[PDB]
Amino acid sequence: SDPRTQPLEIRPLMISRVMEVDWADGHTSRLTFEHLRVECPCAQIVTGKEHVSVVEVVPVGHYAVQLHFSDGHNTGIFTWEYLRRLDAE
Ligand SMILES: [Cl-]
Ligand SMILES: [Zn+2]
Numbered sequence: 001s002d003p004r005t006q007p008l009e010i011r012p013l014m015i016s017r018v019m020e021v022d023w024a025d026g027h028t029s030r031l032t033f034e035h036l037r038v039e040c041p042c043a044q045i046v047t048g049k050e051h052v053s054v055v056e057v058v059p060v061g062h063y064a065v066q067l068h069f070s071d072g073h074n075t076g077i078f079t080w081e082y083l084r085r086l087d088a089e
Pocket of ligand 1 (some may be wrong): 026030031032
């Protein structure tokens with residue numbers, strides 16, 4: 001019941017390379033495909049993903065989405081809580 005992490009709609013935008021998520025607190029996250037890829041849950045310097053895109057967004061139960069990326073990587077289950085957290089980190 002946390003409005004911050006209840007998604008209303010998800011819009012992966014291929015041209016601008018950002019995934020928008022509207023949340024129940026009225027916030028919309030705009031998370032770049034690049035950012036999502038380099039923070040994919042599935043000191044090092046993680047780089048080289050500026051040209052990667054999200055090819056598909058598949059819901060996982062009610063708690064997460066699986067993002068499929070253009071570099072073949074398709075593990076990466078992102079919980080709603082995690083996606084919201086990426087808006088600041
Ligand atoms: Cl971002
Ligand atoms: Zn980050």
